[PDB]
Design a protein around this ligand. Structure first.
Ligand SMILES: CC(=O)SCCNC(=O)CCNC(=O)[C@H](O)C(C)(C)COP(=O)(O)OP(=O)(O)OC[C@H]1O[C@@H](n2cnc3c(N)ncnc32)[C@H](O)[C@@H]1OP(=O)(O)O
Ligand SMILES: CC(C)(COP(=O)(O)OP(=O)(O)OC[C@H]1O[C@@H](n2cnc3c(N)ncnc32)[C@H](O)[C@@H]1OP(=O)(O)O)[C@@H](O)C(=O)NCCC(=O)NCCS
Ligand SMILES: O=C([O-])CC(=O)C(=O)O
Ligand SMILES: O=C([O-])CC(=O)C(=O)O
Ligand SMILES: O=C([O-])CC(=O)C(=O)O
Lengths: 442, 441, 440, 441
């Protein structure tokens, strides 16, 4: 498999380079660590490594150096499905792992690997899923189902039998192949059992990964396959500092396998502060629609935005700190709606918003960035094609972000990064010492 | 419950204090952040707040200011079971939450809440546990059963009903009582199914929390109860920077409830680098006894230690970097053995090790610490009484450590600390800019 | 446990005696092995060892030298339940193992050990039984339940860890205590699921083993407790050579643990020539009662007996492989019935058969034994007290016969007897050499 | 089906021949019965009839007069798979029942019958299997599933309804066909659940019986299919007197159906001294290999054999109750290894064992047969092809041995042999009487 033969060459180089970076430049200072950082969620503190994606506050997130547009269209385009436009997550994943663009064949090998292993979800994983009351939240069911599959972990097995640190990444790749293949199956199982009368649709062995997720949920239109593919591409990764990506690295750092690290990560993604934005945006949009008995005019939408902001509320999906431009992930999805559903009422509102809202956020002047993010666009897309089960949206997210998390975990284990072990401090000590302490600088 | 009425008075005070500390001293620098932290798992980086316990290099861990001697023996001794000597975790928990020492009444209220609530483990939790093949690792079973119980989360439900941040700690507390009550039942269920022929022993409503775990695992000797109480006490908390306590805090920072954070924390505990040390020690002691056909002499042990150190190995249970004195958690456990099982042979090796290994580690001069930690003593105690299922040792650990994780989670949600969102950096950026960075100093 | 302390003395002794026998007398001839033996199910062949019991053609079974009357009536009467008359099987089991008569206190130890270990049937055993469809034959359910419990086998675990032959008996004893405690629980569960609407009754912790089976099956009655005690006493053991006992020895001889060897045995007891006769007697008694609208005359019964034989059938409950006199196991149940239900009409038919059928069978002139065996009497007792689930009768048998199976397997492992592996022969060889062989 | 048409003529002939023999040659003496026989496991005592096969002390097994070479290569080579070399068990079975060598067409009739009925394993058997904890030994799982399926016995249903003794062999044949079809499915379910992540592969209707078992286990190489064919053939049958065959006859004799008689026989095969030796052989080789970190010297193996003897353990894979020479089932398997895997490490240890272990057992002086048996060789063959789960090896044996068990049960109910019921004797009797008894010569 190209993906592995390649990683067999690159990872020992990278390991040597990281060893060199630690020895030679370990003592280079990047910043001051303050009291503020400890009480402030480490916000700003350069504490983590991640090589799969990087946010440039001018341009947006980039995957191994490449912009999102570049990878969606033009000579840098990632391989599609036969007769498709949208880039397959399978090829995206190859990129995150190798830093290199995959060929057509490279991607067909990953799709085949995911397809073959998609048949190897253990029966007991379903037994476990069926044991959970049906009204359990989908993110609980999802994480639990992932965790139960831990019995099949090749990393745990091999760790216990005795394996060199040099082989960690190989076992992590093998487990990641297995778990990634499992996720559409588990997710679909949950979807079907909760929402669609407990009727189960098997994988089609001719579909790519994302499309199979759609097929197994019960959607077979070409457009939905294309949506799923795009969705999975865009949401795959976003640095390592978000709660879910961080949890993954943290639990991985103790040599806990991907089933443990990833399911932990999902427990994190399930949190209301990490995993709900998509849904809140959508719910808002639909409230607008109900309020104005249809699409509002440019004027009505300005009047509403002003009243929202003046009673101290936020406009969902707009105005998050890190960027200073429009999220490429938003732009990609706008592009998709304009092509395949331009006359959708709820999307018209989203389109009106893209025109109005940043003009209102600029003249209100409370947001240093007035532009939308990826979560501003996704909801209407799902809803249009009849995926209307808000709670489940976070599962879809989780399915995508496993691309990032597995790639990251394979790499840091390839690099042989040590256990994540910050130092906590007590308020007792803060109060003892704070006066004696230098201000940030000197 | 006094604990609640008390937290009602204290947590607003602590919330206002922490606001003030952030405003007035946020800009105070504690240390240099380096490349080395980012590629070194943040070793040393004062990035977290934990007010439940603190490690002093020259004394050991302290719980809310108080040493282990103070609480176990000393002038501030925590309430025991009737007839008992060892401190009840129920009172330690009270202390971790309030920073104040419990009365006998306070401990009984907590004991009584854990007992009542021990009857409220949903049937579906057992269904889930049973659906897992019996040869599944017990820490996977443990974390999965806890996670399944997420459906009963009061936090989760109240968050969606819409609730002020001001009330977070109350929901966290409620869930924390339910979960803690459930942990012994889940852990016992796993033990009985895997190791004891799938026969199930119900909670005794007259036993404290620790004892009930022993009871439900099928051990009713007073000494065993006393061991369980001590164990649960010693292992309850060790700062917030360790993987499990950190995982707990991290996932909690997203407003995920205690079942999600604690199950996640347990996935980290399951990690070979975090959860196995007392087993490794015990097997080490067990190998010595096999090798010398009994307790080695001073001289056999010294040779074997020097041989060990001269092939680049470490001696398990000894020579950890943070302490510079013997871990008081080790001392308390040695005190227990000397008193209750002094002729146990594996104990005799452990005790001999206490004399011999520090001397060999001083002479060898490589260790900045020649002394043992908790993990060097805990195995032979468990094994003495017939808890011999190595893999399950991490579950006992987990049960104890829930006392600390719950306390820390209740607290930081009282404080209303924000989400944990550090910044990641690229090797690409480091390789570019490293040469142009100042050196720390 | 006195039982163990005693076996700890006795088995080393017996093992040395058996060694001595094999060395000094191994080549001592007992009988001729013939072609009839090989094609005739080994009838008469002294091929096996059993020290628990011996079946005398002209006297009946003896348990370690002691007759049923000796142990039920006196002058060597075993301990009873408090206020009971019937011997407790706990006491019989003690005697089968040691060859010594138990004290009262020795029997309470065993009762208390069964009661304690009764609480230790694994949940997964029930899981297994519930997965069997409810119309499954109950002997199928029984053997499966026992076999599933093989996962808790101490012999199996210890064998793998490494143990010398001398230690086998101790592992066999531990498993036998666990399994024997389990059988009443498993039997009751099957009974209650099949026949009593799937409601389940726990062990009562102040009942002996036999009476706990009755209790858990739903019958709380002194006479019933007494019947079960007697029943379990009587079917306990009957030499080494019957199909169930022999199956147990055979599978045991390859170092398979008691769950394997006993479940195998129950597969054999489930067989129509070994375990169904109780039932066939009852049905035949009920047929008589229906035809003649009550208890028949001696004339009506004789006709019906002749009509049974002319239609090519056996008269059930009569005859035996080796017995040639009235089975003492029959007589003991006759005494029970005379005492507790002498006006019961089915019983009346059974009693009338005792006077009439032996004459019929003597004249018929085929049967080598014209007298009743145990199976002639058991059904009408069970039926009288409200146990009417015919197929389940063989389970009760199974629970009892466990007593002798456990004792024998423990002993033979104590002795360290080797694997049972006789030589087979072909019909081709026989045909070629038969003329040249000597006669016996 | 030719098989049945042929049995319908042959069995009445055999029935009558038997009846005549019982009548005419009942009192023919074959040998003396001794105290030795009663206390020595009947060793040598001609106490059973078997017509499928006969084990010669000095040559090993013959199936209906034919040797293994004769049927595998020799002038009377059984039909293979298309493009195959190894003989198919389907044809050996036809030989066992009829005494006649099958055609191509007769073997395809049986293969097709197995294939068709492979689909008819009830759902409840799989429910029973899953109800068992996954760490249950395979041989217990195998026996239990077989036993659960007793519900579908035609013989037990027809017996309960009233059926003549003459229709017995017919009901036994119908049941055997169904059960034999079931055993690969049942065996493969156990293999998959325990060892391959609880995913399940359906039968392939284009495969013969042995190959389909591999297929359903997860192994599809031709050489693997060939190994299974040879394996199922070699372990089919071995006289009446082996513990499994005899347990089957014993239970059969009370009119218990094949599901009861064969599950019973499997509880006997599971014994360390019987079929479980194929597992024990590999466990023993493993301990060897670990002790000397690789292929040991002659001296190291010598020392190792003796240490197992001196610790009161058996050396698995050597010895036999009738064999007094190297087992031709062994020689056959060696042949297979030399051809297919001559350089395998484990195979080298087995080859070494063939020189050394007989030498040890001669000097030790107790074994009547110092040479290897079938179970010495079988494990290494499977291990080579990636079937390394040695606890499963006795299940494969069982699937094969069902062939012999079914052939014998059908025949003996055709002959109408009676219940097996030898006489037991007491030790008390032996003491009193022994001095008076004649010495046998
Ligand atoms: C069932 C099958 O498929 S094949 C054979 C069984 N499988 C095994 O490899 C088990 C190991 N082998 C043995 O135990 C024996 O050879 C068996 C199982 C065949 C038993 O057969 P027996 O006829 O009782 O053996 P044999 O007549 O040689 O026994 C005489 C003595 O030799 C010993 N002996 C025989 N084979 C072995 C052996 N492989 N290792 C150690 N001791 C042995 C016996 O234990 C006995 O010792 P004892 O006098 O202290 O009781
Ligand atoms: C138990 C039993 C099967 C043993 O049979 P056995 O060892 O073959 O007995 P015998 O040596 O007395 O058999 C000789 C003949 O008498 C016949 N016979 C024996 N008992 C008989 C009976 N109760 N009714 C009719 N005929 C009988 C046999 O069928 C045989 O007939 P055959 O010569 O036509 O073949 C036999 O006595 C019998 O069939 N009994 C009835 C069933 C029963 O109640 N069994 C309980 C067993 S504890
Ligand atoms: O005891 C532990 O788990 C280690 C620990 O607390 C820490 O390093 O902070
Ligand atoms: O003894 C026999 O063979 C038949 C019998 O009565 C029994 O097994 O109890
Ligand atoms: O064990 C026996 O006696 C004969 C046999 O099956 C065997 O070698 O498998």
């Amino acid at each position: 498999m190209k993906l592995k033969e390649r990683l067999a060459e690159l990872i020992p180089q990278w390991r040597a380079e990281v060893a060199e970076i630690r020895k030679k430049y370990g003592n280079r200072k990047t910043m001051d660590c303050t009291i503020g950082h400890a009480y402030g969620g480490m916000r700003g503190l350069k504490a983590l490594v991640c090589d799969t994606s990087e946010v440039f506050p001018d341009e947006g997130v980039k995957f191994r150096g490449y912009t999102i547009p570049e990878l969606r269209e033009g000579p840098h385009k990632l391989p599609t499905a036969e007769g498709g436009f949208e880039p397959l997550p399978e090829g995206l994943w190859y990129l995150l792992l190798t830093g290199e663009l995959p060929t057509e064949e490279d991607v067909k090998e990953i799709s085949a690997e995911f397809t073959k292993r998609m048949q190897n979800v253990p029966q007991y994983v379903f037994d476990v899923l069926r044991a959970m009351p049906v009204d359990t939240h989908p993110m609980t069911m999802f994480a639990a189902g992932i965790l139960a599959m831990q019995r099949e972990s090749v990393f745990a097995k091999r760790y216990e039998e005795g394996m060199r640190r040099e082989e960690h990444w190989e076992a992590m790749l093998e487990d990641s192949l297995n778990m990634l293949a499992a996720l559409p199956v588990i997710a679909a199982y949950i979807y079907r059992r909760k929402y669609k009368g407990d009727t189960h649709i098997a994988p089609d062995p001719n579909l790519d990964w994302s499309a199979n997720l759609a097929h197994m949920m019960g959607f077979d239109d070409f457009e939905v396959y294309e949506l799923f593919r795009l969705y999975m591409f865009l949401h795959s990764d976003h640095e390592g500092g978000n709660v879910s990506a961080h949890t993954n690295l943290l639990v991985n750092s103790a040599y806990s396998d991907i089933y443990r690290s990833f399911s932990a990560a999902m427990n994190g993604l399930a949190g209301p502060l990490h995993g709900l934005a998509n849904q809140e945006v959508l719910r808002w949009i639909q409230m607008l629609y109900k309020k104005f008995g249809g699409v509002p005019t440019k004027e009505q939408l300005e009047r509403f935005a002003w009243d929202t902001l003046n009673s101290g509320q936020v406009i969902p999906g707009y105005g998050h700190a890190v960027l200073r431009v429009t999220d490429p992930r938003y732009v990609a999805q706008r592009d998709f709606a304009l092509k395949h559903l331009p006359d959708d009422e709820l999307f018209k509102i989203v389109s009106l918003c893209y025109e109005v809202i940043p003009e209102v956020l600029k003249k209100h002047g409370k947001a240093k960035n007035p532009w939308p993010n990826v979560d501003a666009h996704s909801g209407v897309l799902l809803w249009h094609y009849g995926i209307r089960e808000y709670d489940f949206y976070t599962v879809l997210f989780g399915v995508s972000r496993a691309l990032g998390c597995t790639a990251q975990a394979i790499l840091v284990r390839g690099y042989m990064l040590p256990i994540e072990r910050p130092k906590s401090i007590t308020t007792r000590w803060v109060k003892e010492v704070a006066e004696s302490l230098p201000v940030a600088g000197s």
